């Protein structure tokens, strides 16, 4: 649904979708050959099906070709300042693929807008849909376009076939949000039986490790998934299938 969305929004008023309550098989995403840029900040593009996440964000764009480099941590530039800000400690992937077919009409497809004037750079994931006229001088504008009074939005266009870095790149961005809470979106692993009192290599809801899983006497609260020790290491775990 998110990847094959009918139409996306422009970068300035970008659409955010919430993804949860499932299993997910990202390996098909990596094995597509349809994605010109598949770069991730922290993950192996592989092995991504061995993880568990609480909330998976899907942000998605109409940015320009030469611009894709800016959808990344630590970048600075036109979109990365007033249109979309990734945080420094971003934990996700940035999937880009030029859709010139979908939106590039002769005489240019102009549906897609971007803020060009802004007083201050955005905070991470901050979205600004303000349509106030930009006061670029010392005199008030009062919604009157003219000198030092410019509407802060502009239309990209994306000429049909004139884009080498001037083409629509629907940059979908996954932001992987984990509270060390109930993970909810994690990949197709077969939940084998459980073995007790024996050293095993376990993977509970994305929490990995090696140890001896024994019956406890601790009293967990209904909202708690796992205890911890003084060392910040895992101490007790709730079986996600058996309470």
């Amino acid at each position, epitope marked *: 649904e998110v990847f094959n969305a009918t139409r996306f929004a422009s970068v300035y008023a970008w659409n955010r979708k919430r993804i949860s309550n499932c299993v997910a098989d990202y390996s098909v995403l990596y094995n597509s050959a349809s994605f010109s840029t598949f770069k991730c900040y922290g993950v192996s593009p592989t092995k991504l099906n061995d993880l568990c996440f609480t909330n998976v964000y899907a942000d998605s764009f109409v940015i320009r070709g030469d611009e894709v480099r800016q959808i990344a941590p630590g970048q600075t530039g036109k979109i990365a300042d007033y249109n979309y800000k990734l945080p420094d400690d971003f934990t996700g992937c940035v999937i880009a693929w030029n859709s010139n077919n979908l939106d590039s009409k002769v005489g240019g497809n102009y*549906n897609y807008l971007y803020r060009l004037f802004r007083k201050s750079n955005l905070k991470p994931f901050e979205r600004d849909i303000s349509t106030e006229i930009y006061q670029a001088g010392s005199t008030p504008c009062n919604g009157v376009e003219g000198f030092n009074c410019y509407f802060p939005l502009q239309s990209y266009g994306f000429q049909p076939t004139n884009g080498v870095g001037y083409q629509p790149y629907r940059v979908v961005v996954l932001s992987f949000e984990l509270l060390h809470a109930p993970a909810t979106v994690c990949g197709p692993k077969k939940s084998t039986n459980l073995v007790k009192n024996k050293c095993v290599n376990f993977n509970f809801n994305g929490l990995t490790g090696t140890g001896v899983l024994t019956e406890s006497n601790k009293k967990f609260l209904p909202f708690q998934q796992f205890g911890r020790d003084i060392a910040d290491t895992t101490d007790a775990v709730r079986d996600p299938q058996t309470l």
Partner: antibody
Amino acid sequence: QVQLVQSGAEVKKPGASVKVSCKASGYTFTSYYMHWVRQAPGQGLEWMGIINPSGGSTSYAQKLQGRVTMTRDTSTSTVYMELSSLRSEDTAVYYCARANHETTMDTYYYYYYMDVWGKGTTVTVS
Amino acid sequence: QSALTQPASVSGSPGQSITISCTGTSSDVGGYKYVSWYQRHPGKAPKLMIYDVSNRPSGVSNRFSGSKSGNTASLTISGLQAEDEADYYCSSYTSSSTSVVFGGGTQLTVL
């Protein structure tokens, strides 16, 4: 003297196909776009679609599926306008229009400024 | 979208100023800064005076100005004459199926 000329008028009955030209003058034919606007009787002006003199890439209004194919000629700087399966409301004054910027690489200015014009060419269908 | 809304006919007097309204959709005028107006001398070709809402081609008399707010574009003619009697059409790019929309038109009759 940058000026656009189509052919004379046509008299059609429904179901036919019609050939409208538009030669250009006074500029570089491969730079600007060619826009096309008609005037239905009593209702205002109406754009079909366009064609790029550089490559010939086409597009048009959804409401005009399959009933329009825009062709062109770079050698004579002439662009051609086609409308098949003609109906009564197709009676209109058909204009050829030039874009107010040259096709430019890595561009920003949008290419729908309708600024240079044909004399006009009325279609009669009944 | 649909055809824009223009007054059917506005009259006045020479030297007096008359303004013409143009209402559309937020996807026709309110999302964009691309309003352009036109005029019809009877039996003649269009002529562009307005584009970039308040901007102008070279050679248009300083009597015609364009304005923008909300869903309303507007054209103002300062110092009217019988020279000015014509039909008037506002145009805009749209963020939808089509790309260009026009108003119904306005006949300015000089009395």
